[PDB]
Design a protein around this ligand. Sequence first.
Ligand code: 3Z7
Length: 129
Amino acid sequence: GSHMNPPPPETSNPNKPKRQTNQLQYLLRVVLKTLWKHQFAWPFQQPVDAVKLNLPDYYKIIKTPMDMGTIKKRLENNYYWNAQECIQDFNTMFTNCYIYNKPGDDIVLMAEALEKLFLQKINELPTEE
Ligand SMILES: COc1cc(Br)ccc1O
């Protein structure tokens, strides 16, 4: 895309060891599936296009970008070794939103609704088997 947006996060790397675990399967089949289809998912389904949104400071502030489209691809590509890596990606996505935006803001309200759902689902994450 625009040279003024950063390259998106890595979703493929043959040198990175990978595994499928039951926890990772749950994160794709239950957690991501639930959040992806939520009414408020759309701002989080792809990287922030700071040029199109006219937010030239976005990637000055947010140095650790993450989005659900990247997480979806990481899960589909079996990019992760364990569930914590994936959970950390979701946490980074929510924290980016809270850092950049204000407590009033529509996108924050949306992120908070998604994060509540995420927490509920992670509380039921199965033991690794
Ligand atoms: C309002 O700024 C934004 C912040 C994040 Br994080 C995602 C989308 C946005 O529009």
